[PDB]
Structures are given as C-alpha cells and as structure tokens.
Write a protein that binds this ligand. Structure first.
Ligand SMILES: [Cl-]
Ligand SMILES: [Co+2]
Ligand SMILES: [Co+2]
Length: 219
C-alpha cells in the first residue's frame, strides 16, 4: 500500500435484516438499509453507497444476490470516475466478492482484484451515529463521500493514519462501549461536526492507540 490507487471494498453490510419472533412463534425477517464501504487507505477517502431496501424488491436469496449488487455498484462508481481517478487494485474484504467483481469488471483490464485476510470491520461504522443514522433513515439509494482520516494527514503519514483507523474500527467491533470511552479521554473531548473521530492531542492519541490495541488483544 501507499504508492497506485487502491480501494478496499467491504460488502458485509449490504444485505441487513431484522429478525423478530412473532406472537405466533415464527421468525419474520425484514430487510433494512445497508451500505457498501469503498475505501482508499492512502488518502482516507470513503465512498459510502447506501443500499435502500427498494433494491431487493421482487428478489430472492438476497444474501447471495447482495454480492452481485455490490459488484454492480462498484463498477458503476468506476465508470462515473475519470480514468485518472479509477483504482489500479481492488482488495475485497470477503472472498465471495471475487467472482462477481471479476465479471462486472471485464471492461477494466487495468484493474487487479484480490482478496485479503486483513481484519477491516467497516461494520463498526454502523455504530458511529453519523453513519448509522444516515443509513437507517435513507429513503432511496445514494452515495456519500467521507474523509475517514479527518485532519490527521496534516501531521502523520498515511501508514500511521491507516493503522490508527484500523485500531479504532477493530476496537469498536470487539467492544463498542469500551472503545467509545477510550476515545473520550476527557469530559471536554469533542468531535468537530465535519469530522468522524475526536479532536485529540498527539499524546492523547498515543495512549488511545495502546488502549485500543489492548482491547482488541483482550477480545
Ligand atoms: Cl505512508
Ligand atoms: Co441495476
Ligand atoms: Co477537518
């Protein structure tokens, strides 16, 4: 990483449901909105493609179909971008995306597709209110741009930023409530409205990163 334009693509959160046991003792499954996370680790750019439940209208085996819908939407994004902004490599977080992406990207011979064993839980973002409410309340498909590194690259490298983000996402995934306490070291810690993450000093980030790492180790 950190050279070629690289995207991580996470399809985990595209097909989401709620399950409820009825008074009659049966389980009802109802789709709720999801999202594709498409992430550039060098710049911090996130394309968030909100997946409105209208897309499942008619359809069956929505779990499997979701992988194809993901590939469709990645291809669509690519075709909306100038060639200079298109990725050279796409790294899928889940191996089931490999074949749907290969087929949807046949017109893009420059683009290398591969899998990964990296733990990159974008699902944790569903716990960050900014994302979670936006996804919950959407009434139609849309794509929203974010910068997941806030102002960090002013003073740290992309490598350091990436590592910090992963620690944050993994910690949220393993223990949301404890990770949120670690990320709020003082009563006066705040997050700027256009930021994702808190405004912390260098010293405060050092402590945060060690505590996050420890939380992930404790699992
Ligand atoms: Cl770097
Ligand atoms: Co279509
Ligand atoms: Co800023």
């Amino acid at each position: 990483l950190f050279s070629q334009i690289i995207w991580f693509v996470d399809d985990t959160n595209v097909y989401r449901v709620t399950i409820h046991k009825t008074f009659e003792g049966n389980l009802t499954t109802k789709p709720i909105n999801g999202a594709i996370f498409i992430f550039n680790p060098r710049t911090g750019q996130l394309f968030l493609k909100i997946i409105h439940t209208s897309v499942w209208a008619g359809q069956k085996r929505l779990g499997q179909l979701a992988k194809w819908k993901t590939a469709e939407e990645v291809a669509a994004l690519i075709r909306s971008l100038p060639v200079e902004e298109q990725p050279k490599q796409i790294i899928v977080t889940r191996k089931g995306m490999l074949d749907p992406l290969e087929v949807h990207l046949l017109d893009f011979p420059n683009i290398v597709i591969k899998g990964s064993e990296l733990q990159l839980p974008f699902q944790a973002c569903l716990k960050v209110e900014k994302f979670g409410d936006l996804i919950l309340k959407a009434t139609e498909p849309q794509m929203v741009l974010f910068n997941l590194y806030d102002d960090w690259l002013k003073t740290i490298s992309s490598y350091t930023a990436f590592s910090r983000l992963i620690l944050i996402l993994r910690a949220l995934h393993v223990n949301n409530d404890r990770a949120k306490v670690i990320l709020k070291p003082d009563k006066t810690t705040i997050t700027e409205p256009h930021h994702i993450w808190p405004t912390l000093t260098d010293e405060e980030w050092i402590k945060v990163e060690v505590q996050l790492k420890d939380l992930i180790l404790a699992d």
